[PDB]
Structures are given as structure tokens and as C-alpha cells.
Symmetry: D2
Subunit: 181 residues, 4 copies
């Protein structure tokens, strides 16, 4: 079908793009930032808010003390209780959502480490501990683009893989207590 083709092309295109963006040493660094962090936070709005919730679900099941926030007040009250043992991962596909960029800046002022995920090379000039570049959507118009989560989910999974192999014995045992009840 012609519409079926557009969707599957958008999928393989961002697949094809994601291949070229992957910085494996950056991803293993982030996995280590998570392991070393005491408290970990995921910020995003809209569909990037859904990505942040997905991450909370998966890493909490490997034993991570974390929390997903998806609005401005939640960002403000949460950054006000961060310190140097915290890590914040911010998700913003455009790179331009002010609540996310401002909340990463607030977290940095409190000494937290910061990671921004975005499809737009940052203009902030290496302001955050890390900036993970994700695929851009192929479709030019917002209305026909595929799930905004997808560029982010790729890197979700990649970091998940690297993180699972740090201290896995302790993490597989936490994962499996769910089925064992």
C-alpha cells in the first residue's frame, strides 16, 4: 500500500540514521553515570515524557532509585532537592523546550550531572555532562511524522544493554523477584 510504505520507510530511515549516530563510548559512560548515581531523574514533556516514564519502568526493575517527571513544577521541586550524587537525563527532540533546558541548567547549578537527548545538535556548546544525538524524523511535516518516542527508544535500549552488564548479578535478581511473587 502507498501509506504502508511511507511509515515503513520512516522506520528504516531512522534505523539507517540511528546507525550513523551511535557513540558507543558515550553510551557506556552514561550507563556508568547511572550505576554511580544514587538518585536518577528523567525529564520530558509530551511524547518525550512517555520516553522518560518508559526508562523509569525499566531501570527501577534493575534496582535503580529513579523517578520520571513530566511537567514544569515537578522539574522545579525536584531540582531543588538534587545534589552532587544525582543524575538527570533530559529528553527534548527539538532541543528547544524551555522547561527541559532550564531544568537541566537548574540541576547543574545544584551539582547534579546532566544528559540531554536531542535530534538537534546543541547550540548550548557542551553545557551538559553529555549530549546524546538521536535520529531526526525523515518526514518533513509534523503531522505525518511517526512516533516521536522512536529516536529516543533506540538509545534507551542501547544504554539499557550497557547498564545491565554492570553488576548484573544484583540486577537480574531484582528483575526476577517480580515473577517470583
Amino acid at each position: 500500500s502507498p501509506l504502508t510504505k511511507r511509515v515503513l520507510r520512516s522506520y528504516s530511515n531512522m534505523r539507517e540514521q540511528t546507525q550513523d549516530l551511535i557513540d558507543e563510548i558515550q553510551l557506556e559512560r552514561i550507563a556508568q553515570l547511572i550505576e554511580d548515581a544514587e538518585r536518577i531523574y528523567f525529564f520530558g514533556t509530551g511524547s518525550s515524557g512517555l520516553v522518560a516514564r518508559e526508562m523509569k519502568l525499566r531501570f527501577m526493575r534493575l534496582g535503580v532509585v529513579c523517578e520520571a517527571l513530566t511537567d514544569q513544577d515537578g522539574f522545579a521541586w525536584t531540582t531543588s532537592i538534587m545534589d552532587e550524587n544525582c543524575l538527570v537525563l533530559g529528553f527534548s527532540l527539538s532541543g528547544s523546550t524551555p522547561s527541559i533546558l532550564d531544568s537541566l541548567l537548574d540541576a547543574k547549578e545544584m551539582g547534579a550531572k546532566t544528559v540531554l537527548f536531542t535530534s538537534v545538535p546543541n547550540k548550548d556548546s557542551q553545557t551538559y555532562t553529555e549530549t546524546v544525538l538521536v535520529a531526526t524524523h525523515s518526514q518533513p511535516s509534523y503531522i505525518q511524522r511517526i512516533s516521536a518516542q522512536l529516536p529516543m527508544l533506540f538509545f534507551i535500549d542501547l544504554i539499557y544493554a550497557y547498564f545491565l552488564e554492570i553488576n548484573r548479578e544484583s540486577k537480574e535478581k531484582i528483575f526476577n523477584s517480580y515473577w517470583e511473587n
Copy 2:
């Protein structure tokens, strides 16, 4: 390149190939007319399947659809009690075994609503439902190494949405674009 990076990327590409196989262009085209047809659309799911339900709500409301996503059983119960034949429920259960979802689809049918189930496991119990959409399985046998549980569903969501937007498009594109109108006080501008 890395082995871990290697395992993740073939998980993605295998479900791209297995998805490619499972599509039924005409079933998804049908499911698209049911959303237009319904007056009230509900999306039900738990865990990661709830996140899929939340995303459908976000995308279809922006095309003008009256809809709501629910993600625990009490919301299923109270919501099904106000359904009628002009209601459509989409239920998401990758395992196909989550009782809260199967039971609330049975509940929705009782009220006369049309019903669609999304699952990686086929069955004959789902014959009760108006449609059953078959989605890709993951490939990692280890549940803990599987890639994100949303993905088999996001494919078919993207497919149905692609179809849905071409039904009565002018007015759906109007509603979508209003978020960027300069008059919209809570809009993107701000």
C-alpha cells in the same frame, strides 16, 4: 559494532522484518474507519502497554478525536459502565494474558462497544472482539534483555494513524495546526 550494541540493533531489525510480515493493510484500514465512526474512543493498557495507550491519545486528540487512555483496572471498570454502541475500545496486551485488559474488553462488548485487541499471541477467545491485531514478538528469550515493550505496538499505531489521517483530512489538519495559531493562548508560541 560492540556486542551489546550488536544484540540491540538486530533485535530492532528482526522486529522490523517480522512486523513487515504481519501487516494486513485492509484490517488496519478497517480499524481506521472505526475510529472515525466512533464518537468516543478509549485506549486501555498497563505497564509499557499503557504508555502506548497514552501516545495514541496524544496523537489522535490532535486530529480531533474524543478519546481517553486508561491504565489501571478501576478506570477500566468505571469507563466501561458509560460505554454504548458508539464507543470504540482499543486494548493493548503484548503477552495477550493480562486479565484486566481481556476482562475489560469483555465488559466493553457487553455495553455494545466495538472492541480491538493488540497482542503478540493469537487465540480463538479473541474472536469475541471486533478485531485482533497481531504484532511482532520480541526475539530475546530472556525477558530482561528484551528491547522496549512498546515497539511492536508503535508500528501498528503508526500504520493506523497514517491511514486515519487520510480520512477527512482537511478538518483534522485544521485542528492539528491550531496549536501553532498565534491566537491560541496555550499554544506552541508560548
Copy 3:
């Protein structure tokens, strides 16, 4: 203990003030607006978002087709699909949260009816369909106030009672269906 007495005094004072604020005719009108509307929206942020969510829960069980939204994008996308048959209830205790005031102005431009709940009167609110005055708190310092939901819960409960007596038999049946032996998800 004086702490204990201070908290309890806050609850008593709120209840006294609420009685002094009630306009029963207005509350009856608002009950009627809910019943007449085809779709009802509850808008709030922070503690006022929780108020909105509870109202959605209780009125859904009486058959109302309704939704609670608690952020700016939810407000914008929802107002863009409103019409003459919709009703928006906005909760802002301070009466000044811009997203809420703006969301009701956007709703009004789509033809929808609008109700603002606030503890701070204003002549700017003159533009909405109804303005419901709720109680202020009685602790001068914000950090010692009791829950910010409470002024609103009083009036939600008043509206609920008036509403339940409008075509009650049909609403009590929907509410009772949750306990029906046929109801699978139900307890």
C-alpha cells in the same frame, strides 16, 4: 498541643468561611451546566490538578463523560476540540495561574461554557460563565497552610450533592454497576 490545635483550627475556619461563601442558587446552576453539557473538562495544575482528577473520578461514576487535564499542552489540545456543548471547570486557588486563565479564555472562544473556581475575586473573571468563590486559607505563611485542595473539595462536594439529585435514578444505576455480578473489572 498548639500545633495540633493550629491544624484543626485551619480546618474549622475553612468550613466556617465556606458556609459564609456558599451561593446555593449558583451551585444548583453549575450542577445543571454539568448535566446539560455533552463533554466536561476539569483543568488544574499542582494541587488543583489533583482536585480536577478527583472530580473526574466521582462524576464519571455517575455517568458524566469527562476528563481531567493538568498541563498546558493538555489544555491547548483539548480546547482545540471543544464546541458549544462543552463545559470547562478551571481550578486556580490564587486566581492567577496563567495557564488556567488562558485555558478558560481559549475554551470560551471555541464556544464552550466556563467555570472558574478561585479564592481571590476579580473583575477580569467577569468574562467566564460562572466564578465560584472558595475559601481562603487562614495561615499567613504559605508553608504552614493546610492542603490546597480543601477549599475546592468543599465546593466540589456541594456541587456533587446537587448534581446527584438531578435525574438521580439513572446516575445511581451507573454508580451501582461497579458492584454488579456481571462486571468483570469491578469490586
Copy 4:
């Protein structure tokens, strides 16, 4: 107007009952338990989940590290990461909602301290660190009852006030940081 009086009587009745049920020493203890805890969890379903969400909002702004959980999957994954530095507050007005009773039991097994809030006493809550009795409602028919949050909000506000006075200076600094010139109010 008989309606208006009924709703107001329900509020007054609950205030009067709440005062009779308060155990001031227990509340100070729970306030001290929250401070002493490293991580605090609030569990509730339905209206009791909104109560838990508001507790999270208010105690976080005083510097508490906490999270609210309002469904069964969330409870299990959270208990599987608890330990002795943890406190969980469980809200069940009926006292009989199984996901709440069970998961609090899981949490004690993990080493966590436990607090059930309920309006129905029971001897099989004697396994928890604390049981806070809250007020029942005063309407016979469930459909005519006031917000189900209210019995819990009374006691949450009591605990809040006790807690605010432990190390108040540092808590007021965190609370006020929301109004400092830093980004995102």
C-alpha cells in the same frame, strides 16, 4: 439547602471525629520516621492514590526524597528495591484493599518500616510499625459520602505540621528555593 446542610454536617462530623481519634505521640513518631528515613514511598489506589500524590508534592518541597505509587505493578517494583532506610505509607480507607495490605507486607519483609492509614481497625495490621486510624464517613450510602480523600488529608496535614518543626530551618530553605531567581520558578 437540606443538601447543603448535609454536606456541611459531613465535613463538621469528620472534623469532630478526627479530633477524637488523634494520638499526638504517634503522629510525632511518624514525623520523626519520615525524617530518619532515606527514601519514603506513598501507596494508594483510587482516591487514596490522590492522597498519596499530594503527600509526595508537599513533603518533596520540604526536601524529602519520596515517590507516590498508585497501581499494583508500581507497588511490586518499588518493594523489590526497599531496604532498612525506607518508609512506606499505605493509604486504604477501607483497610481491606489487598494490593495495599500485601505490598506493605512485602516492604516489611524487605526491611522497610511501615505505616497503614485506615478507618477500620484490625488486629492483622498489628504487623506494621504504625497504624493510623482515620475518621469514617457519616453517610450510610456510599454514593452520598464526602470526598474519600478527606479522612486522610486531616492526618497528613497533622503529620506535615509536626514534620515541618523538625529541623525547620533547612526545610524552609528548600521550600523557599522555589521562589529564588534560579530558572523554572
